[PDB]
Enzyme design. Structure first.
Site, PDB file in Angstrom:
ATOM      1  N   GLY G  48      17.774  20.176  37.578  1.00  0.00           N
ATOM      2  CA  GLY G  48      19.127  20.376  36.565  1.00  0.00           C
ATOM      3  C   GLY G  48      18.277  20.112  35.108  1.00  0.00           C
ATOM      4  N   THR G  49      19.125  20.651  34.206  1.00  0.00           N
ATOM      5  CA  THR G  49      18.892  20.567  32.786  1.00  0.00           C
ATOM      6  C   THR G  49      19.333  19.151  32.128  1.00  0.00           C
ATOM      7  OG1 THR G  49      19.120  23.140  32.814  1.00  0.00           O
ATOM      8  CG2 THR G  49      19.136  21.670  30.535  1.00  0.00           C
ATOM      9  N   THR G  50      18.644  18.867  31.120  1.00  0.00           N
ATOM     10  CA  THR G  50      18.961  17.632  30.443  1.00  0.00           C
ATOM     11  C   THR G  50      20.400  17.704  29.973  1.00  0.00           C
ATOM     12  OG1 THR G  50      18.114  15.925  28.753  1.00  0.00           O
ATOM     13  CG2 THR G  50      18.046  18.508  28.252  1.00  0.00           C
ATOM     14  N   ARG G  67      19.162  25.557  32.317  1.00  0.00           N
ATOM     15  CA  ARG G  67      17.585  26.074  32.553  1.00  0.00           C
ATOM     16  C   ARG G  67      17.271  25.425  33.682  1.00  0.00           C
TER      17      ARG G  67
END
Lengths: 196, 119, 233, 232, 228, 245, 223, 231, 246
Positions: G48-50, G67
């Site tokens: 996963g993305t931040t 992303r």
């Protein structure tokens, strides 16, 4: 001391469209170097407007495809209607996460056309986290085939897309890609298998 | 497959016990081997009997063992289970599960009756 | 017996076992409950032998949790067992929420358990009709009333036990909304004494507030029963 | 009188009672008739309708390709049996990748009938089913409440079953080696005789299966055409 | 179950006009000893079905017993001749068994080939099967069938399938010289070619050859013969 | 009178009334002949109660099954209990060849089935098995052997046995001549004569529809095989011609 | 049947979706880890993305980049009409447990006619995540939403963590986002300034297509 | 005397018939399965004035797109609704699409009939009337304790349901709009209410075709549809 | 009510299910005699079908009819009672012998086998769940000290030692008769006592059953120290003993 996982090869490419999806793939199998056959069907038909294609090890992908077909037939018989591609996608995700600690060595791609006349392609991973990908591919060729797809699609009729898919897969073979291609296409009136 | 079955039970953290580190995978260590120390032996005995004599012998043995075991006190006070000892022919033998002892804590008697026979 | 339907449907669509549980409840002692504003007085009939029996051990206005409380009529041991179950369930619910158990959830759980004992093999119905009093998650006082059949319904002023209908009619005639603490305790005492001999030793009334269940002192009970005796004549 | 209390007690004549009451329950059900030919087995039947507001209760259930059945008894038993044969057919087509033998499925369900009528604290199924199929030949089967399966050329269940049985026995020789339209006409005439009440689109349940034609209920227009044909 | 101890070398199976021809070498090497040279490699489950292996003898013999009992169950509930299962059914059974053992981490050390005929329009010997003791009929390639089951349960269908050391180099010769609907003499010559290169270019191979044919007549066990 | 309501309970004078209820039920059910011959054995099943039912397909309802293609098993009781016992015989042979690799000897199979049928006649809640099963086989060296477990669980070795309706009349008919010397090919005519004569329901037309057969003799290499209709039809014609005169 | 069970017992010849299979290896809890020694192509899960979530005066801002293999994967799940769950770490694990938590919350709202608290949902998710701790489980979630006890920003992880606060961010490069947020942050911030701060901090995070949502007391908007 | 599973001489289960004898005793409920949606209503049989009239509700939501009405034994019916919504949300978990009404009533039926060993001991003496919208429009269903579930155009359950079903047969017509369905349901109710049709003495839940949400009508809506009735 | 149905003590004791089982054993009227000599133990029975609904027929191999069986190799037995129950008790005794041989590492003793079977029949009697086995056995065996041992039990489970006994109908007066024959034994090589015990057992059966007992209606078996293996004596030798007695 026996790892129950091996790489059998596969270059299942994908490409959506305005009202079509092109889930082409190879028909070649090999342990590590030597080829088993030259015609190994892997694209299993789920419903009349939905198919699945994967580049994983042959046993796991065949068992997963057969199990998904059994579940879809049970759903059809108990409910008297074909499941939607979203329903099939959620079923595949739950099936994949059901074996999370002993995961399937299977990189699935679920292609189809919704009831609203819209082609959708869903890329998957080992455990089940999937995404609606306009262009995607899995396996050994994913390193070499994806940037061409980003260059083309991201930057049109079904003929130009089919020609681009043929050019891309033949370029990949020039670059365990395969020797024969099955260009599946799902138009508005069911699937059309096109051997190549 | 394994690890029980999720059913949206919503009662995951109890006020009587905590989950084990292995949950229900049951990793093979000495306690796991000692847990299946009597089930495996009787599996071998039923294999021998119903092989050489016929599976009806195993059927009669299992029904007799369940019937005599069904004749026991409610959960709580320990049951003698003499008839089970006669049927399984372990009355002549004294073994590690007969002697020694386990002292056992947080569950009320009614929860034990619910857990034992599904009420 | 084990795996045997003790309760079954009769020829006229009735569960005779649940019916027997109902008159078993009716043969038990009385208990009255009132609600108003943000508190709920609770009273039970006390029956002890003078000079021999210990009134301290005979407890009826138990507290289930921080807020909810339960009274009962009928079988005392069945009440104690279901009380242990409900207290354990309240601690289970407070473990998962880290918030106090509302009255509606525990009332529904009591109804579910009492239904389960009327639908499982090898278990007879619980011979009690408990009524729970406490605050919801909204922090509004409410009272529920279960039965051996498992039916539950919210109540504003309800009574159970022997001669329950007379107390119910009296409360329906006399109950007001948004009453004071003294008025609520007086109404509860008069309601229970409508079907109980007028004496201080036969009542153990307590008032439930958000702080706790405060048991009323003996002197207040003596003054109120003397006042009721004066008002009767 | 005294021996019918449980399903593990035989009379002085050596005969069950609960099984006979299950057979009577099958006899109380609505009518259904099926006729085979050389390579086509029609399975028609009535559809129960409690009141004018209620639409009819659907009878026919498709178990698998070239496999569909008709209930003539208790609905819950029919549902459980349909689920079991559905799971069996799908499991067989899953593991082995081929169609299941109809004889094996019939024997398996009759085996379940045997287990459920053997032990106490259990009741035999109050339903009979036409396990009809085209496993490389038209077949119609029938499993009774007692553990037993039979095979016929034609069949009827309950209601005015005598009229259908008489008509089928009278015209048994025309049924073999006849066209699909003639077979449909004969089966619908048998159902009309069972009514002795008239056939309509809602209550009629015509279904066709055979060579190059999997199980699929016929549409409303063709059904109306056939019911017009039998009427004149 | 633990690892290979007593292993074979290879088995070569091809199709031709009248049926399948499959050939083992009757060898069971005890690591580096070569104790036995008369082991029965290619089994026969029933008519129009043969199950060859290349690997541990115990796993193959256990699978042989399982397939034999499946055949006896099949015969025990037989009414028509068409009720006999085709080789595809047995092949899927062996694939599922190997997959189940792969899940359990108790792998079956064999490389199975299941070969036969998936129809009964040509022969009529299965109405009167005899377990305890004319001219060849041409058979189309569609009605013939041969399959494979790997260590990991991998399976497929092809015209010619090889196991073990034959999979590396003999497959090239088979792909070079295979033709559709060959005569028995040319087919046997191709088998002799495959097994002589196996004998020369392997240590655990052998020259005491077994040949067995699966045709409209049924299963025919040709006598042993030494290679030229 | 109370004691007869449960198989487990004993009667005051030592006879389980439930067991004779099984016997009455089987005696009022479909008959089953079988006997031994010089060439082999022959077992016959006649379905007389199906005479009212003029719906059954031609010779589709077969009551004679086989185990390992070596042993014949038949019955006369209810279909479901017999099928359960048949599948138990198949399972016993399965386990035997799994764990010993040799075909099950017949005395092992009949003994295990006898104790299995008896294993339900000592409990209280399971319905007792209502089926009288006849097992048979023939070997060249050992000649022939025909066993018959009764529903009580009583196995005896028989040279010939008949069970069901008119069983006494059929057993009287078989005992007229010694059938050890009569060949299997010729005994079909005598069997046809007995079923046409002893049984009142069986007319001339019903002999071919509602009758079943199988041998184990030298012609089929001592293995299971049903009689082909080309063999039955001359025997049927000869029997009808003889009985008509 | 019992007959088939005993037959399989003597012969030594022996699957719902929600049941979880495990390896027959000696220690299944480390099994995946042992498999990670053998290869890493299979164990390349979509990460996963931040995510960056924070309270302010009017509501809560929750921003996350796209992303993953992929760059258009949604990173926020609708747990409830007022509770929005985030995704960080292993996408499959957090996604599946967010959906299962949402189903538990739907059952609780149905039987118990009352809106659940964010504290309760965080506690339930932390309990089930701790239930399968040690088996291998990567998941970073930031529960955020309204409840009758005001707003709440509970943060839960695979290890049974449960931390209440007002400022949180989890994922790759979360320390940079924390640095920018500590450099500039105020509770009494406008909605436009708040979303600008969130966009700037996310752009700083993924430098060394952002999607942002505003949760308010009557649900959440999509801007 | 006899077990929970014993056939009568007429091939009818005794316990099933006794369960069907109990469903008649209950509160009236009426539903119309018009093309626009389902208008499942109820009675609100008030035991006394001291009833709070918030915890005693007959119309419960199995799901957002499903409505139902309970009759007969009430705790049993609550157990049915609880299991139905549990498996409905389970279906939502496995499959993305919301559960159809038909499959939900199959889950309810196989809950009801599991009392026979074919754990639960005795049959569920409840007669539910499930109704809701799915992709093929509105659907109204019914499940007596015998398990012979059947869909209805319009139906009534509870005590004195004979007059309700007769009047529904005598008034219902095809192509009826949603307001016509509302006034028809209220007229049928008022002609089977023993007491007067006040605003607070009735509960109605609607699942509309476009919205597909379980909207339980408030006091103002109930008052409006009572006011718009004819003489 | 239902006191006589289940294994219930009933008024003034007298558990009646055991008596009904004993009567059912008696109704089969297959007399079987057992006699113990010195370094020998003859067991003799009748090759006749038990009385029941069916009847004997000419088309029946009468050699297959038998009541004497072998437990393992040295300890024999003879159940008289119902058809299924007799062979079921034979298999239960075989199972106990297998238990003893597997666990203790040597062959089971007749006394231990009799006590184990008595305990199992005790479990059957006390529990009313299962029907009682109506089959009374008669076990013989050679002990480790090379001595004969005769034993018998009943459906009651009364395992006790014996020197000469009989099971079946007319077992009351016969207790005297065998004693008189032991009186004849009261007033030698191994074969001498073997022959004496064999002819004494045959004479006992002849006096009890009271008819000629042709050679095709006797099954004789003996365990002695010379052989020690349970073997059935052939028909011709039985005919020789019958002719010698007459």
């Amino acid at each position: 001391r026996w790892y129950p996982y091996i790489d059998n090869g596969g270059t299942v490419i994908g490409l959506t469209g305005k009202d079509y999806v092109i889930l082409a793939a190879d028909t070649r199998l090999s342990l590590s170097y030597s080829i088993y056959t030259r015609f190994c069907p892997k694209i299993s038909k789920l419903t009349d407007k939905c198919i699945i294609g994967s580049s994983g090890m042959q046993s796991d992908i065949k068992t997963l495809h057969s199990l998904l077909q059994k579940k879809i037939q049970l759903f059809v018989l108990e409910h008297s209607h074909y499941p939607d591609i979203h329903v099939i996608a959620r079923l595949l995700c739950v099936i994949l996460y059901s074996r999370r600690f002993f995961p399937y060595y299977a990189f699935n791609i679920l292609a189809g056309v919704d009831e609203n006349n819209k082609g959708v392609l869903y890329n998957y991973d080992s455990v089940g986290s999937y995404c609606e990908a306009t262009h995607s591919c899995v396996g050994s060729g994913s390193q070499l085939i994806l940037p061409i797809l980003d260059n083309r699609v991201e930057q049109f009729n079904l003929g130009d897309d089919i020609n681009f898919v043929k050019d891309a897969i033949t370029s990949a073979t020039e670059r365990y890609t395969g020797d024969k291609t099955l260009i599946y296409v799902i138009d508005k009136m069911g699937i059309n298998v096109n051997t190549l | 497959n394994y690890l029980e079955k999720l059913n949206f039970d919503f009662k995951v953290k109890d006020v009587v016990s905590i989950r084990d580190i292995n949950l229900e995978g049951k990793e093979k260590n000495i306690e796991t081997f000692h847990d299946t120390i009597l089930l495996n032996e009787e599996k071998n005995f039923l294999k021998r009997t119903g092989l050489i004599y016929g599976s009806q012998e195993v059927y009669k043995n299992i029904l007799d063992r369940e019937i005599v075991s069904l004749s026991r006190r409610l959960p709580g006070i320990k049951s003698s289970l003499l008839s089970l000892d006669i049927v399984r022919n372990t009355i002549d033998r004294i073994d590690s599960y007969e002697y020694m002892e386990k002292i056992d804590p947080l569950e009320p008697l009614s929860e034990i009756i619910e857990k034992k026979m599904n009420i | 017996s084990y795996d045997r339907a003790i309760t079954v449907f009769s020829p006229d669509g009735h569960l005779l076992q649940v019916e027997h549980a109902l008159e078993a409840v009716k043969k038990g002692g009385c208990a009255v409950a009132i609600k108003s504003s943000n508190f709920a007085v609770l009273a039970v009939e006390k029956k002890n032998i003078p000079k021999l029996q210990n009134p301290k051990t005979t407890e009826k206005l138990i507290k289930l949790d921080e807020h909810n409380c339960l009274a009962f009529a009928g079988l005392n041991a069945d009440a104690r067992v279901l009380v242990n179950k409900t207290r354990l369930e309240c601690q289970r619910y407070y473990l998962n929420m880290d918030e106090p158990a509302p009255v509606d959830y525990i009332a529904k759980y009591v109804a579910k358990v009492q239904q389960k004992f009327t639908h499982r093999g090898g278990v007879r119905p619980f011979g009690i009709a408990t009524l729970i009093a406490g605050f919801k998650n909204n922090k509004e006082i409410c009272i529920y009333q279960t039965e051996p059949s498992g039916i539950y319904a919210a109540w504003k002023a309800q009574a159970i036990g022997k001669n329950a209908k007379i107390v119910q009619e009296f409360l329906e005639k006399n109950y007001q909304e948004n009453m004071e603490q003294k008025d609520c305790i007086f109404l509860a005492l008069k309601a229970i004494f409508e079907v109980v001999e007028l004496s201080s030793k036969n009542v153990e009334v307590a008032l439930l507030t958000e702080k706790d269940l405060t048991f009323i002192e003996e002197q207040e009970i003596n003054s109120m029963v003397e006042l009721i005796d004066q008002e009767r004549t | 009188n005294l021996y019918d209390t449980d399903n593990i007690i035989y009379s002085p004549e050596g005969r069950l009672y609960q099984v006979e009451y299950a057979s009577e329950a099958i006899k109380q059900g609505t009518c259904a008739v099926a006729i085979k030919s050389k390579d086509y087995v029609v399975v028609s039947g009535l559809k129960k309708c409690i009141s004018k507001l209620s639409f009819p209760q659907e009878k026919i259930f498709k178990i698998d390709d070239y496999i569909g059945i008709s209930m003539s008894g208790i609905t819950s038993d029919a549902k459980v049996l349909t689920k079991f044969m559905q799971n069996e057919c799908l499991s067989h087509k899953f593991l082995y990748n081929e169609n299941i033998n109809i004889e094996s499925l019939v024997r398996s369900v009759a085996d379940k009938y045997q287990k459920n009528t053997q032990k106490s604290s259990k009741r035999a199924f109050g339903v009979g089913l036409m396990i009809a199929a085209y496993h490389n030949e038209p077949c119609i089967f029938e499993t009774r409440p007692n553990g037993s399966y039979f095979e016929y050329d034609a069949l009827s269940f309950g209601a005015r079953s005598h009229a259908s049985k008489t008509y089928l026995e009278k015209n048994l020789h025309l049924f073999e080696e006849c066209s699909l339209e003639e077979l449909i006409l004969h089966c619908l005439k048998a159902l009309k005789c069972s009514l002795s009440s008239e056939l309509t689109i809602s209550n009629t349940a015509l279904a066709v299966v055979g060579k190059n034609h999997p199980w699929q209920e016929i549409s409303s227009l063709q059904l109306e055409e056939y019911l017009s044909k039998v009427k004149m | 179950t633990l690892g290979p101890v007593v292993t074979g070398t290879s088995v070569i199976a091809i199709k031709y006009k009248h049926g399948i021809m499959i050939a083992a070498d009757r060898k069971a090497s005890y690591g580096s000893y070569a104790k036995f040279q008369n082991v029965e490699r290619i089994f026969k489950i029933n008519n129009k079905t043969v199950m060859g292996f290349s690997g541990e003898l115990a796993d193959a013999q256990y699978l042989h017993e399982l397939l034999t009992r499946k055949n006896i169950n099949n015969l025990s509930e037989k009414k028509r001749k068409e009720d006999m299962y085709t080789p595809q059914h047995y092949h899927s059974y062996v694939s599922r068994v190997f997959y189940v053992r792969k899940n359990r981490i108790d792998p079956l050390f064999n490389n199975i080939i299941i070969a036969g005929i998936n129809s009964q329009k040509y022969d009529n010997n299965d109405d009167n099967v005899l377990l305890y003791t004319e001219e060849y009929k041409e058979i189309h390639k569609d009605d013939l069938y041969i399959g494979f089951v790997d260590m990991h349960g991998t399976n497929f269908c092809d015209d010619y399938i090889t196991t073990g050391y034959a999979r590396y180099f003999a497959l090239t010769l088979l792909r070079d010289h295979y033709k559709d609907n060959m005569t028995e003499e040319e087919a046997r010559i191709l088998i002799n070619e495959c097994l002589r290169i196996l004998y020369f270019r392997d240590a655990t191979s052998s020259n005491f050859i077994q040949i067995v044919k699966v045709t409209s007549k049924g299963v025919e066990y040709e006598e042993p013969y030494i290679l030229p | 009178a109370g004691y007869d309501l449960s198989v487990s309970t004993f009667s005051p004078d030592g006879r389980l009334y439930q067991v004779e209820y099984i016997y009455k039920s089987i005696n009022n059910n479909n008959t089953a002949l079988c006997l031994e011959c010089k060439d082999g054995i022959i077992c016959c099943c006649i379905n007389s109660n199906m005479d009212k039912n003029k719906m059954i397909k031609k010779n589709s309802y077969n009551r004679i099954y086989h185990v390992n293609n070596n042993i014949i098993i038949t019955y006369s009781g209810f279909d479901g209990d017999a099928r359960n016992i048949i599948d138990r015989a198949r399972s016993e042979a399965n386990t035997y060849y799994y764990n010993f690799h040799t075909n099950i000897p017949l005395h092992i199979l009949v003994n295990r089935i006898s104790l299995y049928i008896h294993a339900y006649t000592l409990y209280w809640h399971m319905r007792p098995f209502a089926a009288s099963i006849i097992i048979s086989s023939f070997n060249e060296k050992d000649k022939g052997d025909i066993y018959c477990i009764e529903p009580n669980g009583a196995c005896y070795k028989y040279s010939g046995i008949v069970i069901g309706k008119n069983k006494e009349m059929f057993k009287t008919e078989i005992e007229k001549k010694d059938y050890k010397d009569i060949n299997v090919r010729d005994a079909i005519e005598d069997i046809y004569k007995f079923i046409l004569t002893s049984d009142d329901h069986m007319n001339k037309n019903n002999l071919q529809n509602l009758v079943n057969f199988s041998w184990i003799c030298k012609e089929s290499s001592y293995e299971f095989q049903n009689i082909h209709e080309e063999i039955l039809t001359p025997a049927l014609n000869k029997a009808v011609e003889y009985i008509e005169k | 049947s019992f007959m088939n069970e005993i037959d399989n017992l003597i012969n030594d010849v022996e699957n719902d979706e929600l049941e979880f299979c495990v390896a027959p290896v000696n220690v299944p809890r480390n099994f995946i880890k042992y498999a990670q020694t053998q290869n890493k192509k299979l164990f390349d899960f979509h990460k996963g993305t931040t995510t960056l979530a924070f309270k302010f005066k009017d509501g809560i801002i929750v921003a996350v980049d796209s992303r993953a293999s992929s760059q258009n994967v949604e990173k926020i799940i609708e747990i409830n009409k007022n509770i929005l769950g985030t995704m960080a770490g292993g996408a499959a694990d957090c996604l599946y447990w967010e959906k299962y938590l949402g189903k538990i919350i739907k059952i609780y709202e149905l039987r118990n006619n009352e809106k659940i608290s964010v504290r309760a949902a965080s506690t339930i998710l932390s309990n089930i995540l701790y239930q399968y701790k040690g088996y291998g489980l990567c998941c970073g979630i930031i529960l955020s939403g309204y409840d009758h006890t005001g707003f709440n920003m509970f943060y839960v992880d695979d290890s049974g963590k449960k931390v209440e606060g007002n400022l949180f961010s989890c994922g790759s490069g979360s320390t940079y986002a924390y640095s920018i947020l500590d450099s500039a942050y105020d509770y009494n911030l406008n909605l436009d300034q708040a979303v600008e701060l969130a966009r700037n901090a996310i752009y700083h995070a993924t430098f060394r297509k952002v999607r942002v949502f505003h949760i308010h007391k009557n649900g959440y908007d999509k801007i | 005397d006899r077990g929970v599973n014993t056939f009568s001489p007429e091939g009818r289960l005794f316990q099933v018939e006794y369960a069907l004898g109990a469903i008649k005793l209950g509160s009236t409920a009426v539903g119309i399965c018009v093309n626009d949606g389902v208008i499942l209503a109820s009675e609100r049989r008030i035991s006394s004035t001291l009833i709070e009239k918030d915890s005693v509700e007959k119309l419960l939501s199995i799901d957002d797109h499903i409505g139902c009405a309970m009759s007969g034994l009430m705790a049993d019916a609550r157990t049915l609704i609880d299991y139905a919504r549990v498996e409905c949300n389970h279906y939502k978990f496995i499959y993305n699409e919301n559960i159809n009404i038909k499959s939900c009533v199959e889950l309810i039926s196989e809950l009801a009939l599991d009392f026979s060993n074919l754990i639960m001991s005795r049959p569920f003496g409840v007669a539910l009337l499930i109704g809701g919208v799915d992709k093929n429009g509105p659907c109204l269903w019914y499940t007596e304790p015998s398990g012979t579930n059947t869909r209805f155009s319009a139906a009534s359950i509870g005590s004195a349901q004979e007059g309700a079903e007769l009047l529904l047969q005598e008034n219902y017509k095809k192509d009826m709009t949603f307001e016509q369905a509302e006034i028809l349901a209220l007229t049928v109710l008022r002609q089977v209410m023993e007491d007067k049709l006040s605003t607070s003495n009735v509960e109605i839940c609607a699942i509309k075709k476009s919205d597909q949400t379980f909207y339980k009508y408030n006091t103002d809506d109930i008052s409006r549809i009572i006011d718009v009735l004819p003489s | 009510m239902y006191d006589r149905h289940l294994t219930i003590f009933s008024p003034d004791g007298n558990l009646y299910q055991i008596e009904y089982a004993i009567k059912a054993v008696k109704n089969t009227n297959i007399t079987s005699v057992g006699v113990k000599g010195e370094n020998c133990a003859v067991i003799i029975s009748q090759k006749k079908m038990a009385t029941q609904y069916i009847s004997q027929d000419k088309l029946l191999d009468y050699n297959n009819i038998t009541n004497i069986y072998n437990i393992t190799d040295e300890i024999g037995c003879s159940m008289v009672g119902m058809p299924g129950d007799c062979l079921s008790m034979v298999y239960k005794a075989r199972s106990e012998a297998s238990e003893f041989l597997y666990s203790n590492g040597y062959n089971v003793n007749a006394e231990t086998l009799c006590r184990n079977i008595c305990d199992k029949i005790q479990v059957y009697t006390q529990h009313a769940y299962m029907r009682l086995h109506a089959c009374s056995g008669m076990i013989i065996g050679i002990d480790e000290n090379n001595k004969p041992e005769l034993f018998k039990f009943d459906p009651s489970g009364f395992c006790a030692g014996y020197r000469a006994c009989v099971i079946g109908n007319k077992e009351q007066e016969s207790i005297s008769v065998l004693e008189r024959l032991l009186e004849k034994r009261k007033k030698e090589t191994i074969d001498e006592d073997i022959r004496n015990t064999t002819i004494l057992a045959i004479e006992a059966l002849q006096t009890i059953l009271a008819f000629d007992l042709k050679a095709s209606e006797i099954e004789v078996a003996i365990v002695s120290t010379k052989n020690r293996n349970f073997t059935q004596i052939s028909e011709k030798e039985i005919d020789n003993y019958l002719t010698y007695i007459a």
